[PDB]
Amino acid sequence: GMRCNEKKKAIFSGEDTLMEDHLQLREKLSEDIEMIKASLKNNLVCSTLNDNEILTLSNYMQFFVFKGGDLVIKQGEKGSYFFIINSGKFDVYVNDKKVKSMGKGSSFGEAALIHNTQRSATIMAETDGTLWGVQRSTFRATLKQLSNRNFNENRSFIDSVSVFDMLTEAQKNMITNACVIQMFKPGETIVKQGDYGDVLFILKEGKATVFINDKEIRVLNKGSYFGERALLYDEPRSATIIAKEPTACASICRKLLNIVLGNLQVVLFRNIMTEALQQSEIFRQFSAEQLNDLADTAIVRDYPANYHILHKKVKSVKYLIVLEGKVELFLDDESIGILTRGKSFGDQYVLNQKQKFRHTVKSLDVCKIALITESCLADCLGDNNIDASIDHNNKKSIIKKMYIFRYLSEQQCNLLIEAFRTTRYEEGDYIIQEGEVGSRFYIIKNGEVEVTKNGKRLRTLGKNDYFGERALLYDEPRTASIISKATSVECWFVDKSVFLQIIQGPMLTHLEERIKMQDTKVEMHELETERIIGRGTFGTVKLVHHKPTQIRYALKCVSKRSIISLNQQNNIKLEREITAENDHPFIIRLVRTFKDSNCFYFLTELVTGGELYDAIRKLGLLSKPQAQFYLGSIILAIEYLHERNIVYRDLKPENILLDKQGYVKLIDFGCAKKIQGRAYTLVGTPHYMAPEVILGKGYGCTVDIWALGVCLYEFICGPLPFGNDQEDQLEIFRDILTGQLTFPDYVSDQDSINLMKRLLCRLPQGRIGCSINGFKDIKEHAFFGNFNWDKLAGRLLEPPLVSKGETYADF
Numbered sequence: 153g154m155r156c157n158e159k160k161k162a163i164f165s166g167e168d169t170l171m172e173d174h175l176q177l178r179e180k181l182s183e184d185i186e187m188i189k190a191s192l193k194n195n196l197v198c199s200t201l202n203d204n205e206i207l208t209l210s211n212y213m214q215f216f217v218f219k220g221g222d223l224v225i226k227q228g229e230k231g232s233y234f235f236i237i238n239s240g241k242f243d244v245y246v247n248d249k250k251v252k253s254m255g256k257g258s259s260f261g262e263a264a265l266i267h268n269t270q271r272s273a274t275i276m277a278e279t280d281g282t283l284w285g286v287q288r289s290t291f292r293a294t295l296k297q298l299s300n301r302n303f304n305e306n307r308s309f310i311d312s313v314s315v316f317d318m319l320t321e322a323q324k325n326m327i328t329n330a331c332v333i334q335m336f337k338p339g340e341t342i343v344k345q346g347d348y349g350d351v352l353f354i355l356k357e358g359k360a361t362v363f364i365n366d367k368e369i370r371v372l373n374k375g376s377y378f379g380e381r382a383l384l385y386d387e388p389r390s391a392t393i394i395a396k397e398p399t400a401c402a403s404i405c406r407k408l409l410n411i412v413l414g415n416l417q418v419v420l421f422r423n424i425m426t427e428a429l430q431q432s433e434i435f436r437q438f439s440a441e442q443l444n445d446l447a448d449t450a451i452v453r454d455y456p457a458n459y460h461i462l463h464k465k466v467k468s469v470k471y472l473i474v475l476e477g478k479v480e481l482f483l484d485d486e487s488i489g490i491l492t493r494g495k496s497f498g499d500q501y502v503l504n505q506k507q508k509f510r511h512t513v514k515s516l517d518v519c520k521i522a523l524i525t526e527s528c529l530a531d532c533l534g535d536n537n538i539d540a541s542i543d544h545n546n547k548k549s550i551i552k553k554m555y556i557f558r559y560l561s562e563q564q565c566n567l568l569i570e571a572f573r574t575t576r577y578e579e580g581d582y583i584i585q586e587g588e589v590g591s592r593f594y595i596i597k598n599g600e601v602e603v604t605k606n607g608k609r610l611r612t613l614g615k616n617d618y619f620g621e622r623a624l625l626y627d628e629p630r631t632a633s634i635i636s637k638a639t640s641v642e643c644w645f646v647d648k649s650v651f652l653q654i655i656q657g658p659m660l661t662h663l664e665e666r667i668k669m670q671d672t673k674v675e676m677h678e679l680e681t682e683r684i685i686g687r688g689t690f691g692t693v694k695l696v697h698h699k700p701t702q703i704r705y706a707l708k709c710v711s712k713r714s715i716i717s718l719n720q721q722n723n724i725k726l727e728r729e730i731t732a733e734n735d736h737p738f739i740i741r742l743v744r745t746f747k748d749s750n751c752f753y754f755l756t757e758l759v760t761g762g763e764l765y766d767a768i769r770k771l772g773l774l775s776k777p778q779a780q781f782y783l784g785s786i787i788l789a790i791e792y793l794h795e796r797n798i799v800y801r802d803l804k805p806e807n808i809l810l811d812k813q814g815y816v817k818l819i820d821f822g823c824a825k826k827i828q829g830r831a832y833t834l835v836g837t838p839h840y841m842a843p844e845v846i847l848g849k850g851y852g853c854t855v856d857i858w859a860l861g862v863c864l865y866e867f868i869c870g871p872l873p874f875g876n877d878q879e880d881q882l883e884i885f886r887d888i889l890t891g892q893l894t895f896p897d898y899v900s901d902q903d904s905i906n907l908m909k910r911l912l913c914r915l916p917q918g919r920i921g922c923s924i925n926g927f928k929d930i931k932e933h934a935f936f937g938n939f940n941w942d943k944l945a946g947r948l949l950e951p952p953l954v955s956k957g958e959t960y961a962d963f
């Protein structure tokens with residue numbers, strides 16, 4: 153009997169432990185449910201909830217039994233429970249001194265339902281008595297599931313309604329939030345025949361009876377819906393729908409749809425038309441707005457079968473799209489194809505404005521056609537020279553994808569496009585030879601080229617690819633060569649001298665410094681720490697000097713003991729991901745991340761102009777131009793992130809630095825997350841936190857827009873709009889949820905107030921910037937009426953403050 157010689161390991165291991173001692177089963181009677189339902193209707197977070205949601209919460213409450221002289225909660229212990237007193241008396245001890253005495257009906261431990269907070273007073277049981285109670289985890293999880301199943305349920309019913317079929321993913325999700333649940337008991341008329349109603353209804357649970365002229369036509373089941381046409385048109389109800397058993401309906405109103413989405417026909421058509429236009433390689437390079445304008449101004453026409461829609465008698469049509477039916481195309485007498493639903497024709501005539509229309513288009517059956525005329529293109533492009541404008545725009549689409557040109561003013565970008573010269577190359581011509589100093593940026597018009605270095609091939613590039621952009625910013629040897637790998641390769645190109653006549657010092661300095669810093673490789677041993685520029689529980693931030701290039705950087709150290717202690721294992725990598733991917737001028741730019749036995753490193757550009765927190769405090773109350781500049785700058789950064797499905801979640805002046813030139817840099821992406829569906833976790837700084845985060849029913853990127861309104865209020869008015877005096881988190885959230893927004897008598901600008909009120913709208917659906925148009929509604933608001941957004945991005949504005957000298961306070 154031999155023994156095992158190789159090793160088996162041992163197994164290892166506050167307020168929730170105590171309540172387990174008092175926990176007990178008890179069947180909930182009618183007297184209990186009604187006192188819970190009463191007590192929750194007066195609660196801070198639960199007051200907004202409907203009866204079915206409060207009924208669900210009431211059942212998750214648990215019974216706890218106490219003898220006299222028993223401890224419930226202790227002042228200093230971490231807070232986790234909320235209580236409604238069922239029987240007996242309970243005394244409240246603050247600093248070991250009796251303040252109050254509570255009986256049946258009263259509640260305590262309110263703040264636990266929002267966050268883990270330290271208890272203020274010690275509650276003790278005077279007599280023998282019992283508590284109804286619920287824990288945060290259970291309360292938040294229940295709130296999550298209620299709102300989240302509601303959303304997913306409603307989105308399926310949106311997907312089942314045919315009128316929404318041509319909405320995009322993002323459009324369908326946005327109208328899902330406009331759904332309102334409406335309950336009907338038996339006997340109740342949902343809709344009456346003859347009324348001009350503007351509401352779609354969808355049966356989730358139950359059954360209803362349909363009456364036309366007081367006669368039973370049919371019965372409707374869970375899934376059935378009615379009122380699609382009521383969202384498009386003013387038309388009377390064809391029937392009287394009456395509920396037969398207790399029923400629950402999801403519903404969209406046209407009034408809220410118009411606020412959220414705009415006109416439904418206009419939005420639907422724009423999608424149909426955008427999809428049809430994108431099948432052409434020409435319109436594929438148009439902007440979303442340009443395609444939307446073509447959709448809004450397109451002539452739409454119904455034709456009978458065997459009709460000559462176009463015949464070489466043409467009404468200046470350049471492009472044709474089939475919406476319904478079929479048409480046959482002819483060149484003289486030869487059929488060249490049949491276009492069905494969604495297909496289109498005319499690329500040849502869109503490109504060549506002056507060409508005679510040689511084709512014939514004959515309807516095969518009854519059809520609906522959209523027609524884009526010569527004027528419809530000119531009004532879209534803003535120019536009567538269509539061929540030149542399409543060409544100009546083709547080039548613009550190429551360069552707007554590059555950082556170097558993306559943020560230049562439209563006037564500068566146009567000038568630069570106009571300056572493009574064209575040249576041709578024989579096969580085997582060295583367009584660029586490595587080692588030589590370049591002065592030209594190229595875009596390939598026609599053909600192919602092959603990139604090489606020290607002999608070996610690296611890549612192959614073709615129509616609309618580009619190369620050599622660095623030569624515009626630097627005087628340096630070309631790292632690779634570019635050989636022509638086709639017969640008659642044509643390139644557009646622009647000289648450095650022309651680029652320097654267009655771009656001005658500030659933008660040029662920004663590009664010079666930025667492109668260079670990522671280019672230069674870095675190792676830890678090459679960096680010397682000059683001085684510490686930031687401290688905290690996270691770790692430290694050092695100002696560092698790179699010996700080889702002499703470029704100065706910033707190096708954040710995140711201690712490993714900090715991350716593993718608070719269970720932020722998965723979060724530090726998601727921060728690395730987000731922080732590395734950001735490539736916007738008003739967001740901090742990462743260079744590289746290093747790994748270490750002690751701390752996680754982040755190396756970024758050095759920002760020398762200090763925090764915005766201090767800048768506004770030097771300025772005092774900001775004027776209209778100054779608030780426009782800073783808020784405008786924050787808007788561009790947040791918009792960039794929202795387009796990449798990132799919600800920032802911690803917007804405050806502290807997290808915004810200023811550079812040498814006085815332009816903003818967003819930092820600290822610790823609270824930031826890649827949004828996939830609805831977020832529920834409670835994060836951020838309480839004074840800037842949106843009411844939808846606090847209420848636990850789901851939030852998205854809209855929270856950063858609330859915070860924007862908080863910042864604007866600080867800029868114009870001075871103090872915070874909510875809980876300015878307050879230190880207790882509970883009383884801040886209370887002021888955020890139910891407090892009054894007021895504005896000082898010295899705030900004389902109507903438009904400023906209007907914007908602040910609309911950014912600080914509690915319900916997101918009514919919050920400016922949160923509809924389908926996104927930030928467009930903020931940017932076009934009267935407050936920004938004289939503000940050139942174009943010049944902000946391109947560094948062509950005088951900023952409010954320029955710092956004299958420097959200012960400081962897988963991996």
Ligand SMILES: CC(C)(C)n1nc(Oc2cccc(Cl)c2)c2c(N)ncnc21
Pocket residue numbers: 685686687693706707708731740754755756757758759760809819820960961
């Ligand atoms: C002033 C402080 C410490 C908040 N800060 N944070 C900064 O932002 C950093 C600095 C290094 C790494 C990361 Cl991920 C962010 C920063 C900077 N780039 N330049 C100067 N000061 C900086």
